[PDB]
Every structure is written in C-alpha cells, then in structure tokens.
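User: For a reading group we're discussing how well predicted structures match intuition. Take tryparedoxin I. Before you show the prediction, I'll give you the sequence so everyone sees exactly what went in.
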Amino acid sequence: SGLDKYLPGIEKLRRGDGEVEVKSLAGKLVFFYFSASWCPPCRGFTPQLIEFYDKFHESKNFEVVFCTWDEEEDGFAGYFAKMPWLAVPFAQSEAVQKLSKHFNVESIPTLIGVDADSGDVVTTRARATLVKDPEGEQFPWKDAPLEHH
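Assistant: Thanks. Here is the predicted 3D structure of tryparedoxin I, as structure tokens, for the group to look at:
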C-alpha cells in the first residue's frame, strides 16, 4: 500500500488480543489516532471516536490505528483494551514517534486520515470536526485542496 510511507515495514497491527495484516486495510480510509492514557483532553475524546467507529467503520469503510504517546506499557495496554480498533504495537513505538514527527503532531488527541491505497492525506482535522459532526455527514472531512497544512 500507500501505508508503507507511514509505517515502514510494519506488516501487521494489533486488534484486540489478535493481529491483522496491514495489507487488509486496502481500499479503506485509515485514521492514525495519536493519543495517550495520561493525556487529559484525550479521555473524553476517545469514547466519542469509539462511538463513531462502532457505528460506521464497516459502512463508511474506514479503520482507526492507535498511535500511542503512552511510554508505560501498562498505561498503553489499559487504554488499548477499551478500544475496538487497531494499534501499532507498543514494541514499535519508535515508528509512532517518527510518524508523529512526520505529520507534525503538536498535541493529542489528533486524528489524521490517509487513503490506505495511495497514502495521500485525506484529512488532518477529524479530531476537531468529529465532535461537531457525530453522524459523519461531512465525513471524511477532507482537507481543503490548494492550501497548506
């Protein structure tokens, strides 16, 4: 895929106490969710993305991949246990730290959605738009063309 740029060499992701192949994300919009258990504004945003996800990840053809800023593995494990989507393994935090820099993530929560097939960036403002569009009437909230982000 186009995700090789963002998760170089990462062939699988965690899902629950299992694993899924990255290649299984083809054709979907893939949201990188930068968050952590210790982050105060993240605690109330997570459930709101969980509700959206449970509703629409199959019909709206998207996936969400937790990219943790947790540094303690029990914090990460505990937060990931409440989530219904995928994560970059805690053992591959270095890949998350590099992606965080790649997208200039300055604070969390932050959600970035990219096309899994081409790797283009489709939206960088979904954390701000989701809370005002719970039903996803403007999803995927594309970033406005012809500008900078």
